Design an enzyme around this catalytic site. Structure first.
Site, PDB file in Angstrom:
ATOM      1  CB  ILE A  71      89.180  -6.274  23.828  1.00 20.61           C
ATOM      2  CG1 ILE A  71      90.512  -5.606  24.215  1.00 20.61           C
ATOM      3  CG2 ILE A  71      88.774  -5.953  22.390  1.00 20.61           C
ATOM      4  CD1 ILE A  71      91.652  -5.885  23.248  1.00 20.61           C
ATOM      5  CD  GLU A 160      96.087 -10.820  29.670  1.00 24.14           C
ATOM      6  OE1 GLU A 160      96.221 -10.216  30.756  1.00 24.14           O
ATOM      7  OE2 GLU A 160      95.342 -11.817  29.542  1.00 24.14           O
ATOM      8  NE  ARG A 163      93.275  -7.855  32.449  1.00 23.07           N
ATOM      9  CZ  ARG A 163      92.689  -8.420  31.395  1.00 23.07           C
ATOM     10  NH1 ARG A 163      93.413  -9.140  30.544  1.00 23.07           N
ATOM     11  NH2 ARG A 163      91.382  -8.277  31.189  1.00 23.07           N
TER      12      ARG A 163
END
Ligand SMILES: *[C@@H]1O[C@H](CO)[C@@H](O[C@@H]2O[C@H](CO)[C@@H](O)[C@H](O)[C@H]2NC(C)=O)[C@H](O)[C@H]1NC(C)=O
Ligand SMILES: Nc1nc2[nH]cnc2c(=O)[nH]1
Length: 246
Positions: A71, A160, A163
């Site tokens: 980000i 996250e 991912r």
């Protein structure tokens, strides 16, 4: 662009959003069946815009680097906000050009610096969908100390979870109640780079890691990952950071 509205949000629509987010990252290759992110992208095509709406319908637009899912900054009404780091200023040349005012936050966007600014490590900050809604609201009104904590929530809920499938599931469990992240969640967040690299190196090596990765698991037990046959690799990790960025 990708969108997500907290109004009427449930585990399923959150799941749809994370899916949309993964699909928006370009990739030319797959390593062991996992999309391998690009080395680089030029111009504005390097940035993906996420539009998030809090419960009441107010919105912020977040810019994400598609090569590493980092980000870079966000737009709240007419003011843009960027982290204090080289890559973010580079990003400011390409997004939110029509912003009336540009503010540079007094930190960079890594966990170490965000935790210092926030006054708490993320072990102590509850996450979930209710927490994401509060984070969006906090970001609409500039406060650097409160923004640091809001960004820690935003990053974990969106980058996250993209991912790692496990983190996405952890957030779905917290759809109506926030809860601090488990130790496994934090261990995973910290090893993305390490894992990404050993998975890429394992190729010309029969699926065996050059050096083992140490993680902490759900039941709370330490552990060593040594090959691509492991759970983390077969069903957890969803994106790989290219080695030309490690
Ligand atoms: C691949 O990882 C697995 C664990 O995910 C490991 O397999 C273990 O290997 C030996 C026997 O094969 C045992 O001492 C371990 O306790 C096994 N654990 C299991 C089956 O849960 C091993 O590290 C890796 N395999 C190879 C061939 O290196
Ligand atoms: N800004 C940003 N920072 C991070 N720090 C650790 N992970 C991330 C991420 O995905 N985006």
């Amino acid at each position: 662009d990708v969108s997500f509205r907290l109004s009427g949000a449930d585990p399923s629509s959150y799941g749809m959003f994370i899916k949309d987010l993964r699909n928006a990252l370009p990739h030319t290759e797959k390593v062991y069946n996992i999309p391998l992110l690009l080395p680089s992208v030029s111009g504005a095509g390097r940035y993906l815009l996420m539009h998030l709406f809090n419960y009441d319908g107010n919105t912020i637009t977040v810019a994400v680097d598609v090569t590493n899912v980092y980000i870079m900054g966000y737009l709240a009404l007419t003011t843009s906000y960027f982290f204090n780091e080289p890559a973010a200023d580079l990003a400011s040349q390409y997004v939110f050009r029509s912003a009336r005012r540009k503010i540079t936050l007094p930190y960079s966007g890594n966990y170490e610096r965000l935790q210092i600014a926030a006054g708490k490590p993320r072990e102590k900050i509850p996450i979930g969908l209710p927490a994401l809604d509060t984070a969006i609201s906090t970001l609409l009104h500039y406060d650097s100390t409160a923004a640091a904590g809001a960004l820690l929530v935003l990053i974990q809920t969106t980058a996250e979870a993209a991912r790692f499938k496990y983190i996405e599931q952890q957030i779905q469990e917290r759809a109506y109640r926030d809860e601090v992240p488990s130790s496994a969640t934090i261990s995973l967040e910290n090893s993305w780079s390490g894992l990404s690299k050993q998975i890429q190196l394992a190729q010309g090596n029969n699926g065996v890691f050059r050096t083992p990765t140490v993680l902490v698991d759900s039941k709370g037990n330490r552990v060593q990952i040594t090959n691509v046959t492991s759970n983390v690799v077969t069903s957890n990790i969803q994106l790989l950071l290219n080695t030309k960025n490690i």
